[PDB]
Design a protein around this ligand. Structure first.
Ligand SMILES: [Zn+2]
Ligand SMILES: [Zn+2]
Ligand SMILES: [Zn+2]
Ligand SMILES: [Zn+2]
Ligand SMILES: [Zn+2]
Lengths: 173, 76
């Protein structure tokens, strides 16, 4: 016999010492949680406490790995194929024929989408607001990708408690 | 490990790999399952291009990570 407090709202309930499922009596909580690891009961079926902890961790790490890949990849609006520009201007032609602006990723029909005025590298255009035809976004994208890895590093420090953190993507140069 | 690879065709396949397998080994295992020649494969993980020289552990590719096959296109 043991008295247990809900891991969320702290409402108390009497539980048999051989029951692992905690069902909170609080009408405004109602959360069903595991009693050994405080994990959510629905997400817990068929898994041990360790297998659930690993499952949520992999879910998080892969979410950041794909968040970094998403910043680098251009997805064709028609066929969904991922594109990367090796060189050239910012007008992309996917193998399906559809065209897109490599900067803002919108679907376009031709060169009329782009600003072609005299324009210094990474400088605003004093005569339009269209996308630069020649600007290379590789450095800016690599910065955004690193911001994701750093923000994922700091959100790990909040959950773990200590200053323990493991890098998600590949290392630095 | 067990990792996922997303084809150009949209299908996601699964591979049995080890962190010591080089990228060339992975491109081979992709060819055995989908018939995609390795010289045609452009692999990208966590936003970074994969090169034939290094291994999966060098790119910090862990369990259930996804490698994306992409088209490396020239602008125009
Ligand atoms: Zn509760
Ligand atoms: Zn549990
Ligand atoms: Zn396409
Ligand atoms: Zn644009
Ligand atoms: Zn302009």
């Amino acid at each position: 016999d043991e008295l247990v407090r809900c891991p969320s709202c702290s409402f108390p309930a009497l539980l048999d010492s051989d029951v692992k499922r905690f069902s909170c009596p609080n009408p405004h909580c109602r959360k069903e949680t595991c009693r050994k690891c405080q994990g959510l009961w629905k997400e817990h079926n068929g898994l041990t406490c360790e297998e659930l902890a690993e499952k949520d961790d992999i879910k998080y790490r892969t979410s950041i790995e794909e968040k970094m890949t998403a910043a680098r990849i251009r997805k064709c609006h028609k066929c969904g194929t991922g594109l990367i520009k090796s060189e050239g201007c910012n007008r992309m032609s996917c193998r399906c024929g559809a065209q897109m602006c490599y900067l803002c990723r919108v679907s376009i029909n031709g060169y009329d989408h782009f600003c072609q005025h005299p324009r210094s590298p990474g400088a605003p255009c004093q005569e339009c607001s269209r996308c630069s035809l020649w600007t290379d976004p590789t450095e800016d994208d690599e910065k955004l990708i690193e911001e994701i890895q750093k923000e994922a590093e700091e959100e790990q420090k909040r959950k773990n408690g200590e200053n323990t953190f493991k890098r998600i993507g590949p290392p630095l140069e | 490990m067990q990792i996922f690879v997303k084809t150009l065709t949209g299908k996601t396949i699964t591979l049995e790999v080890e962190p010591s397998d080089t990228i060339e080994n992975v491109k081979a295992k992709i060819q055995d399952k989908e018939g995609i020649p390795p010289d045609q494969q452009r692999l990208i993980f966590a936003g970074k291009q994969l090169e034939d020289g290094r291994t999966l552990s060098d790119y910090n590719i862990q369990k259930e990570s996804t490698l994306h096959l992409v088209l490396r296109l020239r602008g125009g």
